[PDB]
Design a protein around this ligand. Sequence first.
Ligand SMILES: OC[C@H]1O[C@H](O)[C@@H](O)[C@@H](O)[C@@H]1O
Ligand SMILES: [Ca+2]
Ligand SMILES: [Cl-]
Ligand SMILES: [Cl-]
Ligand SMILES: [Cl-]
Ligand SMILES: [Cl-]
Ligand SMILES: [Cl-]
Ligand SMILES: [Cl-]
Ligand SMILES: [Cl-]
Length: 244
Amino acid sequence: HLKREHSLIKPYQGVGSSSMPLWDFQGSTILTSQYVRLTPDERSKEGSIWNHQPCFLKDWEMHVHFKVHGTGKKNLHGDGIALWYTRDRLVPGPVFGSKDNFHGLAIFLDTYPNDETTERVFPYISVMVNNGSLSYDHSKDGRWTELAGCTADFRNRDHDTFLAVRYSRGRLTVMTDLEDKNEWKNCIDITGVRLPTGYYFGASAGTGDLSDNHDIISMKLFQLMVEHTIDWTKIEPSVNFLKS
Ligand SMILES: OC[C@H]1O[C@H](O)[C@@H](O)[C@@H](O)[C@@H]1O
Ligand SMILES: [Ca+2]
Ligand SMILES: [Cl-]
Ligand SMILES: [Cl-]
Ligand SMILES: [Cl-]
Ligand SMILES: [Cl-]
Ligand SMILES: [Cl-]
Ligand SMILES: [Cl-]
Ligand SMILES: [Cl-]
């Protein structure tokens, strides 16, 4: 149930050949045969990669093989990666290399605590749903708009690191595989998440005074076979909340 057209898999399609590429590469992104480097380990970069077509699956699960790694000493690295399922695509900006006031879903892999009064241990993975009205407060690591999150040790690991994002029937689940255990450990599991079909998958990274290599190695999108019993492209991104 792999959907190849919404995936990035080695050998990358159209790279070193006449075949149709499936992704657009934007900003500081460096394309090599063995990784897509959203930013090099250099300051003040914004790079992204965006699926060349929109996704109309109602129920899906994206697996991302990524690598964040750099030569910054002690805590002097940043800023992280965002994964996107959004109305718009290709616009750079302050939100891990991509535009603010976005429409849809963001999954942030934040590696630098901008918030001087933070309670979190970094890196910190969180999710945000936006109808266009919200601005991600980068200076505060998105504190005001975070729906859920978990600390996650993903930098400079000696083995492969993966993230899974599952969306089906209003349930959004983010899982990690960072500890070389060939298993999905839960990070976030929330319900009442409303997203339309017809949005774009993408990934972006950003660096400022602090930097890191932010690599995407592969992205594999799976269609979930889930029963349904409305115009799904017109659903406004939103979240419904269980009452107290
Ligand atoms: O890179 C770390 C840091 O560098 C600068 O201070 C700014 O660009 C911040 O937004 C960024 O988070
Ligand atoms: Ca941050
Ligand atoms: Cl590809
Ligand atoms: Cl490089
Ligand atoms: Cl800041
Ligand atoms: Cl915020
Ligand atoms: Cl770290
Ligand atoms: Cl390690
Ligand atoms: Cl893990």
